[PDB]
Amino acid sequence: DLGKKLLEAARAGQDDEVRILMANGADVAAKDKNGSTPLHLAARNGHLEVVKLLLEAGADVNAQDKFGKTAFDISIDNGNEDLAEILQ
């Protein structure tokens, strides 16, 4: 499903796939097995470019995963200053 593919594209940092999937109706609110949204996976793997695309596409920046973490929280845990800046 488009959801699963979008979650994978975000996780992998494949913005080319994220653009196509979104343009094809992919749900930016999708969640994987741990309640992680595309925003969370892109953030966890530090794909700042995909994080920006998802935000511009309307992604809920405050979505919380199974551990109650937002993408910002993850970026802070990971010490990714560049990411935290975009998500602050």
Task: Specify the residue for token string 């929280």.
Answer: 73
Q: How big is the CA angle at 14 (ends 69 and 43), to the nearest 5 degrees?
A: 15
Least Cβ distance, residue 12 to Co ion (angstroms):
9
Q: What are φ and ψ of residue 72, in 5° steps?
A: -65, -50
Cβ count near 88 (within 10 Å):
9
Identify which of residues 3 and 13 has a Cβ nearer to Co ion in the complex.
13
Identify which of residues 13 and 35 has a Cβ nearer to Co ion in the complex.
13
Least Cβ distance, residue 19 to Co ion (angstroms):
9
Least Cβ distance, residue 42 to Co ion (angstroms):
8
Q: What are φ and ψ of residue 3, in 5° steps?
A: -60, -55
Identify which of residues 70 and 80 has a Cβ nearer to Co ion in the complex.
80
Lookup: tokens for 15: 């913005």
SS3 17: helix
Identify which of residues 42 and 63 has a Cβ nearer to Co ion in the complex.
42
Enumerate binding residues for Co ion (CB under 5 A).
13, 15, 47
Least Cβ distance, residue 47 to Co ion (angstroms):
4
